[PDB]
């Protein structure tokens, strides 16, 4: 266990060490910062360890040294909280506040916080049934005509979540010397690697390594693979494509080209069409590869 004097001495030592590092690296001690501390310690003590924690670190002492020394009564022995003798003063105080809010209201994308997060915020262990009871009270408060204050109080207890459609990268539109707009992209399938350029306007001409596609791909299956992206969004004969593929076989090359050309075509279609192409499985790299 760490005493307050120990942490105080660590603080003084950290300040002296910060000034020493600033002197070492030639920067001014006054403006020397924690990002500078991280950069300097990484440079002076290089480390390739994957675990970022394992790598040498110089931090403010309190950031490492944890503390859960919450004293609940003073010298006279009187507890600070009027619900102390319940043993769960924080939880029952919160329940009391919620009940009072419900009484007041009666007179007038996201998730519920998990049990462990409520534990961490209350700094008290609680069972599962009492967490159910608290969530039931919160839902009851939500059902009533909760006001702005009550809405904020609930929002204290509702965490967030995200989606997986905004993470789809739409490449920027570039312009060639002639002033023609286009978009470039990459695709991968097994050992085959493809790099495609899709022009905004065209006549449906696809050039694979400088060769027309029906000549580069004799097999009808590969031509259908190349057709799939434009047919899905109904833009056959409306775009020109120039793609360069390398490695793999006929089918791996066709799949890589299909992926690259779909990722390039995402720039000229609507966001709804981008999502539909994603849901059709067109914008996803296939991770199935030969196993040892």
């Amino acid at each position: 266990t760490y005493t307050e004097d120990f942490i105080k001495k660590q603080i003084e030592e950290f300040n002296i060490g910060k000034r020493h590092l600033a002197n070492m690296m030639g920067e001014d001690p006054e403006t020397f910062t924690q990002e500078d501390i991280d950069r300097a310690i990484a440079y002076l003590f290089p480390s390739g360890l994957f675990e970022k924690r394992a790598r040498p670190v110089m931090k403010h002492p309190e950031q490492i040294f944890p503390r859960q020394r919450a004293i609940q009564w003073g010298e006279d022995g009187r507890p600070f909280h009027y619900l102390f003798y319940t043993g769960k003063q924080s939880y029952y105080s919160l329940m009391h506040d919620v009940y009072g809010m419900l009484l007041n209201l009666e007179k007038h994308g996201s998730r519920w916080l998990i049990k462990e997060e409520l534990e961490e915020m209350l700094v008290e262990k609680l069972s599962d049934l009492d967490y159910m009871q608290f969530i039931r009270l919160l839902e009851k408060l939500l059902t009533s005509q909760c006001g702005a204050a009550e809405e904020e109080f609930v929002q204290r207890f509702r965490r967030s979540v995200t989606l997986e459609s905004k993470k789809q990268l739409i490449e920027p539109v570039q312009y060639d010397e002639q002033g023609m707009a286009f978009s470039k992209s990459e695709g991968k399938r097994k050992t085959a690697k493809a790099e495609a350029i899709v022009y905004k306007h065209g006549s449906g001409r696809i050039k694979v390594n400088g060769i027309d596609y029906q000549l580069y791909f004799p097999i009808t299956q590969d031509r259908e693979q190349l057709m799939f992206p434009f047919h899905f969004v109904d833009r056959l004969g409306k775009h020109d494509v120039t793609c360069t593929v390398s490695g793999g076989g006929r089918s791996a090359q066709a799949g890589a080209i299909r992926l690259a050309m779909a990722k390039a075509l995402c720039s000229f279609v609507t966001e709804d069409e981008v999502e539909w192409m994603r849901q059709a499985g067109l914008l996803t790299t296939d991770p199935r590869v030969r196993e040892r």
Partner: protein, 162 residues
């Protein structure tokens, strides 16, 4: 004089202190090379440097006045022995357009050398590694180029029946 700590903390623990820390001792530290130290060292080492001839402003004059390019490699390993067998290799590169060759001489030189000459770049590359040392291989490369030039500028009897 730093409170550097290194190590994955234990549950409700801290990264190990520096005193006795083997991990901090296992790092190849750069404490002896700081920006202040580096600047001081490079300020005192300036006395040992010459100046690039200002006439050679870029490559374009650089393959003009000094056509031949000799590439040689040196290796820094760690151990009791400095010998590395790969350091004897020498690579001479010269652009054939810089050699005083006529049409017949250029044809003969190119189809003597074969794959050593790259049509795209007009560069002939002789790689010499026969001799043990590097000076011997450099001399051999120069000798090869010499004899190659002289035998390309020579028309034998069989040369008549092109």
């Amino acid at each position: 004089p730093l409170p550097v700590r290194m190590g994955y903390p234990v549950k409700k623990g801290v990264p190990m202190a520096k005193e006795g820390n083997l991990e901090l001792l296992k790092i190849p530290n750069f404490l002896h090379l700081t920006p202040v130290a580096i600047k001081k060292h490079c300020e005192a080492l300036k006395d040992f440097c010459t100046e690039w001839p200002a006439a050679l402003d870029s490559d374009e004059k650089c393959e003009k006045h000094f056509p031949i390019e000799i590439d040689s490699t040196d290796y820094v390993s760690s151990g009791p022995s400095v010998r590395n067998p790969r350091a004897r290799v020498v690579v001479l590169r010269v652009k054939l357009s810089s050699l005083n060759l006529d049409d017949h001489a250029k044809k003969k030189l190119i189809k003597l050398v074969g794959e050593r000459y790259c049509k795209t770049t007009d560069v002939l590359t002789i790689k010499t590694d026969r001799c043990p040392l590097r000076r011997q291989n450099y001399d051999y490369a120069v000798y090869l180029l010499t004899v190659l030039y002289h035998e390309s500028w020579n028309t034998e009897e069989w040369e008549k029946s092109k």
